[PDB]
Amino acid sequence: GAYKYLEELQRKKQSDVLRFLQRVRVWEYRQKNVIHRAARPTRPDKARRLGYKAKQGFVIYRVRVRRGNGVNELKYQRSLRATAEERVGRRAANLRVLNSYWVNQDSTYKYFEVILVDPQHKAIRRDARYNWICDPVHKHREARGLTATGKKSRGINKGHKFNNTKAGRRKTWKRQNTLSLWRYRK
Amino acid sequence: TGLLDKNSGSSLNLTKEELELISKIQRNEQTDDSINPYEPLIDWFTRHEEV
Amino acid sequence: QQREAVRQLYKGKKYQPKDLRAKKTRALRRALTKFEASQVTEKQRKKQIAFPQRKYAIKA
Amino acid sequence: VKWPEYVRVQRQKKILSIRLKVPPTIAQFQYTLDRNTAAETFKLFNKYRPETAAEKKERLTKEAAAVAEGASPKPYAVKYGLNHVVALIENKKAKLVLIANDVDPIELVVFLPALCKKMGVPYAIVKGKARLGTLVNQKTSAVAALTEVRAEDEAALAKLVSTIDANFADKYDEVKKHWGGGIL
Amino acid sequence: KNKHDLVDEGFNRYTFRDTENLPDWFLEDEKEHSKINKPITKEAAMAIKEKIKAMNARPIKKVAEAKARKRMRAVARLEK
Amino acid sequence: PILKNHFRKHWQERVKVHFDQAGKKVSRRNARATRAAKIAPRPLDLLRPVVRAPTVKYNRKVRAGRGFTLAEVKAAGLTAAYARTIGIAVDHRRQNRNQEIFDANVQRLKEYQSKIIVFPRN
Amino acid sequence: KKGAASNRTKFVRSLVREIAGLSPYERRLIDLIRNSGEKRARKVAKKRLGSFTRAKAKVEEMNNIIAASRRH
Amino acid sequence: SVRKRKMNRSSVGKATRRNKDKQRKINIQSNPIIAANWDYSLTMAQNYKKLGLRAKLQTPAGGKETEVVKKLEELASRSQSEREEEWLEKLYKKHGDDYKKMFFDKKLNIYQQSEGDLKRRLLRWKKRNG
RNA sequence: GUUCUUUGUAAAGUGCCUUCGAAGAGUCGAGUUGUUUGGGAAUGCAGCUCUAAGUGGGUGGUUCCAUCUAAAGCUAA
RNA sequence: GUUUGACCUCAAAUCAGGUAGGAGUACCCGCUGAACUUAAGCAUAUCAAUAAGCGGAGGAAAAGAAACCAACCGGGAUUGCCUUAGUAACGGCGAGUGAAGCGGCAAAAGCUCAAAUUUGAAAUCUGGUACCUUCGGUGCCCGAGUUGUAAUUUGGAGAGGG
What we know:
Chain H: Its main location: nucleus. This is part of a larger assembly, with eight protein chains of eight kinds. By secondary structure, chain C is mainly alpha-helical.
C-alpha cells in the first residue's frame, strides 16, 4: 500500500524532512485563526486509522491550545488535547467529535487536528458502520471524556492499577462509600 | 557569575568559550562545529536495485 | 378547507410546510428513521443469511 | 497598497518556498521534466483516458440493450491512485510512473521518487497535479502510472522510458545531493 | 555539567535552522516561540538579581524617602 | 480492645437499605417468565462448559466456564458460528490444556447434540 | 509469533531511514562513533533517550548506518 | 411536590395506565404448539417439566412425550438462469465431455474456470434436461 | 398461514491440498513538579524536559517462565 | 501568449436544505473545589477526592469484549449482589483510611475500522430534478471523491487458486 510508508515516516519527527515540514507549518498555523477548518488532513494515514473516511459529512478542524499550568504550578489536571476537543465541540455544535491527533508543537502552543462527523448528513445516517454517532447518546462525547484522550485522562482501562477508576472514579467512590443494609440484617 | 568558587574565596568567572556556548544554546546556533547542517542525502539503501 | 387544499397541492412530495408536517416531539423529529435504523451493513446481512439464530428445544 | 489576509499569506508562503534551505528529498521536485518531454509523455498518456462516467454508463447500457435480446480483450488505461500506484511499483508492474510536483501536504509523495529508483521503475516528476488530473477524469491525481499498453504504443513507451531516463534521471543525479533554496 | 555535557544538550528540537537569509516578520514569530523551558534554581535567580541592580537603585535619597513613606503609614494607623 | 468505625464521613447521605429484596426477586422471576415466553421452546440459558477453578485453594473444585473453545466444538463435530445458533456458548480466549476437562466438555456437547431437536428454517 | 519478520516493514522502516536523514542528536552520534567511539556514544544516547536498552538498539542502528554508507 | 401539586389540581386529567396485571401474566408467542399447551396457573418452570423440556441447562440454585412427540413430528417432516443454461448448451455442443479442452477454450469459457466447476454445472444442466 | 416475486456463470459455508501473509508515536518509556490512591511494589492522572523498538512491546511470577496485544471504534440485560 | 485555461487556498450570498443554544436535573458522565469539624496545641492528615460553582447526556448513563487475573489439575468482556473483609495495604504506624483475585449468585452477546491494488474498469455516496406502490424506490443531471468512497480482510487469523 501507501500508508505504511506514511506511518513510519511520521514516527520520525525530528528527522530532517519532517523537521522542515514542521518548521513551515507551525508558522503557517500561527498566521491563521486559533480554531479554523482544515481543507483536508495533513496526516491522512493517522486520520484514517483514527477513523477518517474521506467522504461527505466528515470534517477536519485544526485547533490551537496554550501549554503549561507554587502559583505557576497550580496544576489544572485536565489535558491540552481535551481542552482543544471541547473548543471545536462548541464552535461546531452540529457535529460530533470522533477523534483527534497531534500535528505540530511549539514552545507556546500544541496543535491538533480534530476529526468530526455530521450526524445529520444522509451519507452518515445510512451506511451502518457510522450511523451509531446519530444516536443521541453521543451528543458531546468530548465534553464527557468519551473520546480516546478523555478515556485516558479518566484512567479508564483494565486491571489492578485502575481499580480506583475502572467504572469511573465518582461511581466507585459512591458505591464503596455506601452503608448497605438488608431487610434481614447481615 | 555571582557565586563563590570552591578552590578560592575569589569570584568564579567564566571562560570566553563557555560564554559563547551559552549564547549559542539560547539562539540555538549550532553547538558542535566541524559538522555540516546541510549534508547531501547519501542514498545508502537505494544504491542497489531490487530484483 | 384552505389547509386540506394546501395538503393536496403538496401531495406526496418532499418538503411540505412546517405546520402541515408531523408535530410529534423534538427528540423524535431527530433520531434515525425506520429505514436508517433498520439499515444494516452489507457484511452483517451475509452473516445473518449464513447463520440465522436457529430455533431449538432440548429434550427429545 | 493593502492586500487581503489570504493573499498576503500565499505571497509570504511563495517567498518562504524560495528563501529557506530545503532538504534534498524535497527540491528533488521542481527539478522536473522539461516542456518537450512533458508534451510527449502526454501525447502517449492522452491515448489512455480512463473511460469517463458517461461513456461507461452508455456502453454498459449498450451491452444490456443488445445482449439481453440478441470475446473482448482487457482494455488498457492509466492507473491513478496513490494506494494503487505504490501498489503497482513493488509488484512490479509499472513502466512509467508520473509524479506531481505540487501536492497539498508535501509529505505524501516524498518517498515515491526514491522508491521508484529503488525498485527500478522508470519515473518522471512531471509539473502539475491539475495537468495530471486532466488525463484522468479527476480534478487532481498526484500520481499516474502506465502498466500495460497496446503494441502500437509499446515502442513509443519504451522510447519514452529511455528519453526520461536520459533527460530526467541523468541530468538530475545531483538532485539526490544538494540542499535546495539557497537563493540570495 | 562540563562542556561535553552541554554540547549534547545543545542539539534541541530547534537546531539546524538558517537565520540570516530569512525575513524579519518570520523570525520575530519563531524566536518568541523557540524557548525550551529548562528547569531553574533560586540560587541562579539570586545572582541575576544581583547582576541587574544598578548604582542609583538605592541611594540615600530613596532610603530616606522610604522611611518617609512608612512614617506616614504609621501615622495613618493612629488616625483611626 | 479492636474496632474501626468508618463513620467520620457524611455516611448518612449514602445509606442503601434493601427493602426491595422481596420486590426484586419477584421482578427477576417475572423477567425470566417473559424471556421464556419469548424464547418458547429453548431453555433460558446457553449450554455452559465444565471448568477447573484457579488457585491452590480451589483447584479441587469443578465449576461452570464461560464458553467451550473452537477446539472443543470442532472435536464435538460442529463449527463455532453454528454452535451459537444452537445455544452453545463459545470462548475464543480460553485455552485447552487439561485432557480430563477437554473430554468432559466434548461428552457434554455430544450428549447435548443427541438430546436437542433443531427446527428447520421452513 | 512475537514480532513476525515481515519482509515489507523491514524494507519500509529502512526506506524511510535513508530518505528522512538523521535527527540532530543522531547526526552528532554518528560523528561521535567515528571520533570518540561507542563508549561516549552510548553515554550521550542514554542521557538523551529513556533507558539503557534504548541506547543499545540506537547506537547499533547508527553503526549499521555507518556499515552500509562506508562499505556497500 | 411542585409539578405534581398542579397536575393533581388541574382540569387536564391524568394519563392513568393500569398495566399491573399484565406484568405477571405474559402470553406465550413464538410457538403455537406450546401456546395451546401452557397452563397459566402453573409457573414457567412447572410448564416446562409438564411438557418435558429442560428449562435451565445449568443445575439451579435452590430446591426443585405428550407434546414433544408432536414437535418431533413436524421436524422429521436452486435452478439456473437463461444465460447460464445457454452458455452450458454452447460448451456441450462444441466439446461434449473433454473438460481439459473445454476449459482451455478462450471463446466459450471466457471466465477461465476449472474442470470441477464445469462438470458440476453441466450435471445440473443435464438433470434439469434429458 | 395464504400469496406475489425470485437469477446471475450471484452470495456464501465445510474439510483437505497448494502459494502467500501488514497489526494504532510527541505514543510506550525516562526524568521531573504537582495532584491523587489501600497501593510501601512508588496507584492513577496532569503539566513541563528529553523521547523508543519490531523473533517487538506490556504485565506479573521463585536461570528463566507464564499471560496479554496498548497508544482506533460500537454494543442489550 | 501582454491572451486564454486548469487547479489550490480563502471568502460572500434574506442562496437550497439542515442543525446548535434554553428548561428539567433524582439518578448518570465530566470539570472545578473549600471550610466548620476530628485528630493534644498542630504546616502533614482528617471531614473529602465531600458541599457550593461550571459544563454534558438518557431511559438509564457509564463501563465493556484484555497491552485482564493468576501461579492453579488454571480461569476468561463489563456491571451488579453475597462473600473476600474491616482482610492485604496506607497512615505523628495517631485520629483514622481501606481494596482486589478467588468461590457463590443475578444477568449475559458479541463485534467493527485503519494497516497488505477493484486496478479486466469508484464497483461508493450526497444533493437537484421527473415520476411511483413514499420513514423510501426508480430515471436523468450537478457534484464529493484516487491526498481513497465501495466490496474482501481484523488474529478466534486471514487471503488467492485447485
